Amino acid sequence: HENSNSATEGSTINYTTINYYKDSYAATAGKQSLKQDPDKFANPVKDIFTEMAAPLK
Amino acid sequence: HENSNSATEGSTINYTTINYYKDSYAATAGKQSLKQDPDKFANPVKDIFTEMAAPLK
Amino acid sequence: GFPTEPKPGTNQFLTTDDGVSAPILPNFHPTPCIHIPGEVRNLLELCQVETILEVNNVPTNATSLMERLRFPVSAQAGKGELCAVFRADPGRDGPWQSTMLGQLCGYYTQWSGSLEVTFMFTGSFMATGKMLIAYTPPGGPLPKDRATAMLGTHVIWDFGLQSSVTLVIPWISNTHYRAHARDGVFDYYTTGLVSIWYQTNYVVPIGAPNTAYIIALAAAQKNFTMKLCKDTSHILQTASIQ
Amino acid sequence: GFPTEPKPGTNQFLTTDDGVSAPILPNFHPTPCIHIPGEVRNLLELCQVETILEVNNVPTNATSLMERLRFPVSAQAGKGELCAVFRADPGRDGPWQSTMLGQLCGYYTQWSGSLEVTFMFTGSFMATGKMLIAYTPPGGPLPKDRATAMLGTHVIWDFGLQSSVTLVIPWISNTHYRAHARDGVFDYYTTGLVSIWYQTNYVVPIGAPNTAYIIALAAAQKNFTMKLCKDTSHILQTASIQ
Amino acid sequence: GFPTEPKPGTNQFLTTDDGVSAPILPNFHPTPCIHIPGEVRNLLELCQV
Amino acid sequence: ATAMLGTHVIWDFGLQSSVTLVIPWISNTHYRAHARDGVFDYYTTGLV
Amino acid sequence: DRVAQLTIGNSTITTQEAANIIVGYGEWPSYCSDDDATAVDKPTRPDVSVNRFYTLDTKLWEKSSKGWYWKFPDVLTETGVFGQNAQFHYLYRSGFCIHVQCNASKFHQGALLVAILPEYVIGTVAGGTGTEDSHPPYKQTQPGADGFELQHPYVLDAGIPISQLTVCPHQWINLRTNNCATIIVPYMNTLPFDSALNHCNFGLLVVPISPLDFDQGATPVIPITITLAPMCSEFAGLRQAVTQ
Amino acid sequence: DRVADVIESSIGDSVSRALTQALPAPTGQNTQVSSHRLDTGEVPALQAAEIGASSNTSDESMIETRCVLNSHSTAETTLDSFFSRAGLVGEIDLPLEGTTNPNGYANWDIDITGYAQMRRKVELFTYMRFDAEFTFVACTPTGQVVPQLLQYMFVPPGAPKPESRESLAWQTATNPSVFVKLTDPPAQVSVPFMSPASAYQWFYDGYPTFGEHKQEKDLEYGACPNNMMGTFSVRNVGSSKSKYPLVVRIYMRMKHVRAWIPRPMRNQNYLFKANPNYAGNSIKPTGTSRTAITTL
Amino acid sequence: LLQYMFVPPGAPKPESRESLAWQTATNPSVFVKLTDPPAQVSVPFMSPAS
Amino acid sequence: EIGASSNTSDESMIETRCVLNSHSTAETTLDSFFSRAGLVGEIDLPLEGTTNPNGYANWDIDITGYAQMRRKVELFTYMRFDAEFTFVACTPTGQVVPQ
């Protein structure tokens, strides 16, 4: 078939690329899945709180 | 699949184009649907009248 | 690699070639298209909209340019006098150059279809009169008198509540399409001649103006078509545009 | 071979072209990817993280740089005095340049969406006060007094257990996207102005400091988007890097 | 791009080569063909006259 | 330019000789007592 | 069909010599879709207080008049409650119902071309020679309610032929036929909302193509009055009142 | 529960009521047989131009017509057929000695309003939305092809414009750049619709900023930033003066075109880029003139 | 580098090397170097006759 | 103080309308941002001088020599990726030579 040696092998993200060689790291960058995780950096709090609530109770 | 970023995206007109890249604005101009709306500029009257009638009654 | 063999035309840059080109901005998405009134789909939509035909293309004076937009009519002597004359050719130098149709034609080598000219009388309510608008197909020299003009396609116009009348210049050609007519050999594609005559006379009471004007508006019919794009005969520029 | 015909663009090297290229190492397999914390998937994830907004971008002294990170508030005379002012424009020279949002904007020609600015009061527990943060949409000149500023989008902030308050600068634009605003013609894309006023006054008992500071943190909302990549206005290099 | 390898005959202009060429006028439509008497399909039709 | 800011009607003379200006009931109270100069001008209807 | 009545708000217009009604580009004014909009704040739709007929200044038609024009969002920015909203709000949006009226007698004659030209950009004569890059003053690009007179109507003071101005929503006032023109214009712009102060969506042109004429004795004063009403007005981005 | 004028209210209707519909028209309309008509009451020929609508009179009602099956295509008059033709819109000079870009680099302000042919066509419409295909033809002033390497860079508004041939901005870490030799066929590239507006405006009747609009600033009237797409920069890929004088002609071909609101076609000569100024002393008629109205 | 341009009847014929007509905003043009293989192009039946 | 960004939304701060936002977030993905070729190295092979005058050169692979490219990548601490290297060669005047 083809070698699975691209830098994104085994990633929880899907790619649509084009290639003409046996090594997949030669493939185009392609399009990708648009998932996002804002909370990871913007709201990494242990005990999440609502916006309607007073943060410090 | 492919990016939907051409200037005619979401248009009430069909196009038959060719492309080799992931961005659809790179596609050929292609052929298009031949619809026309003369009345929009030639007869934008509120109360339409026949040709057999006397315009001003 | 895969055996290929480039043919003539390789590397050439054809202005009208419709091919693919590498996109400069990957994953770029354009601003959504709002709804905007007056969208155009085909230029023929514009060729059917009447625009003022400068039949009176005589005044070139700086202060008299606005009067090319209308021609006079007035009380005569009653002998079927000639009022105005003009070629029916759309893409030819003359009256049609002031119309949108004439301008769009300039961008196409050939056209086909019937044309129409609507004449609006702007005299007073008390003014009466009957005119004879005639269309003389190719070969017919400019009719010397009304009795000759009436032998071709025509319409007797009676002034009244309905201010305007439409002269339809039917598509009467030997060829399916006509290229733009010019003096000389290309006069082969001439459409013919239009001429307005007094059927009776411009009559008016005491107290009303003895001279009134007519405004001609021209456009194309539903069977009008154009083909083979080219550049207009004129380029509105002399030196570099700063 | 198979008949082909190369078109314009042949041999060109387009920086952003996304094509295929011959691999230098056949059958090479990269080191497995371990799990690493803090993986980023989209830059918008960073535009939503608040970073200190240098509203007090006045001190340029070598020893006074750390004080651009916060602005003062103190006991006044009670006439709705002005505290601070700044443009809401994200990709414009000014206070927003100290924020991550402002920095990421520099890499994109256009942006769209609501912005938010959170103000944290760092006075003492015994200090009280009410401020009026107002946002003046485009066209509105810098409000001369509080009575004028309060006519736009605003929020009255009351100091208390909850140290901070959030002023949301709603997306109020004529266009779907805004290009970076600069002085002159591109001021067409200005977002507006923000101004802090004393609603009442900074009150404090005996024994507590008469001057406290406020720290502004800014970021984007969930509807914020950017498009059309470009290079930041500044290049941090003068001579070759050794 | 897709690996190719041009062979001899590249760039040559063969008078009788029957290939494709870029069209100069996009969406151009020719004048309809009327019926005309005496249409010829093969030159052998003339060799018999 | 000031009068046209209120309730109005542009009348065009023609075959129909007349035109009707309707003075709509625009009051603060359900009923109006007769308006006179002074205090009872409180019940004024307006001006034409 | 010759008679008509236009009622909107607390204003009514009457006419007994009309020539139908034109609806620009075959579209009625409408409010902004939820998918065509961007501004997130809830707009104000004052309705009856701003969507009514406002009658601007009157012009006098002379045997030598060249023509006039009015930029539209503009003409109303300092009038009634529409003007107040246009000043207090950053964003504005609306259509218009324009009614130009001019009557004479069965013994007068002449024809006015009443047209709507979107994005009517004014040019200058460039110092006559065409070597000076001069620009039209604020007083001319946005004349207000008093309108402005054309210096070179043949080219519409913008280098374009008036003979083709009929490709735009228009109507004529031919004294022997009608005494008014009614044109309904939808909101036209490349944006869902825009400033009523900096931008003028279109211009109203009233130009005599066939000169006014009459015999001495007939009333010589023939006025041309402009009445217009906003439609589906929406405003957003509230702040203090701004004049310009 | 709720006031009636609010229930029956129509404020909020976002759908545009259209009086017209676009119908299929792949060919010119046919002509149907017509016979004589001698009757009262019906008058096809009589119109009323005051109404503002074009005459709806047809050939059939004006003369006795035959049947004609019109199969003439209307495809060549679509917007794409009309505009999808590359035309000159820019020209950049890179001479050896002179006062015009003599340091081996140039910054062309992206504006297709510098050439009459292309400009007049697009100015037939008020608004236009489209993708485009730019082709760059380079050579010396004599048309000679020289072995020189150039770099074209698109500098969106806000990005740093190169101040010299060795500017740091030529690193193009993010801006799109094209490296070509004059010996290679002209570089060609695809561009999307990159305006923050829904379409480009060839005409903007207004000002870009608020405030007092004094004489000195009338320069800004009619200037719409939604049309200002940035700069196009060129340079000799090197650190020394080039051995040859260069010229770069820029051609543009529009694709996927949408257009709105047609206008009268340019009547007078063009003088400047950002405006419709015309020579007031040389106002020529739209067309040709003649001696008398009664003679050809 | 040469420029070939098809000028249909009615279009402005160039009067010089620097003529404005060379802008080809609508006429079909071909730009080629003499070092490139001969330019080749397809033309339809463009007569108004059959 | 909590260390989390404000979760306040437009809707709770002012009376908002309904807006169906269809603006794409595709151009801010890591690939869109970084998949653009930029200068990272420059090698000189002069005829006479003190910098590689013997017709050869050894460039230590390090993309940290140029500010534009460097500043972008330094926005992140760790990065895993494949790359596409392009080598543009010519003389110091930009002249293309048969070498």
Ligand SMILES: CCCCCCCCCCCCC/C=C\[C@H](O)[C@H](N)CO
């Ligand atoms: C090496 C990459 C080069 C990329 C060049 C990209 C050019 C994109 C150009 C878009 C041009 C749009 C022009 C539209 C409107 C005019 O600028 C305005 N009407 C001028 O007033």
Ligand SMILES: CCCCCCCCCCCCC/C=C\[C@H](O)[C@H](N)CO
């Ligand atoms: C003719 C074949 C040429 C092949 C060239 C292959 C080059 C491969 C380069 C990989 C470069 C990775 C750079 C990554 C990190 C930087 O070196 C470090 N941050 C420097 O401190």
Ligand SMILES: [Cl-]
């Ligand atoms: Cl012709």
Ligand SMILES: [Cl-]
């Ligand atoms: Cl900004």
Ligand code: NA
């Ligand atoms: Na909260």
Ligand code: NA
């Ligand atoms: Na091989």
Ligand code: NA
């Ligand atoms: Na490659």
Ligand code: NA
């Ligand atoms: Na072969």
Ligand code: NA
């Ligand atoms: Na709508």
Ligand code: NA
């Ligand atoms: Na009729």
Ligand code: NA
């Ligand atoms: Na017709």
Ligand code: NA
């Ligand atoms: Na047909």
Ligand code: NA
């Ligand atoms: Na520099």
Ligand code: NA
């Ligand atoms: Na010439």
Ligand code: NA
């Ligand atoms: Na937030």
Ligand code: NA
């Ligand atoms: Na969404």
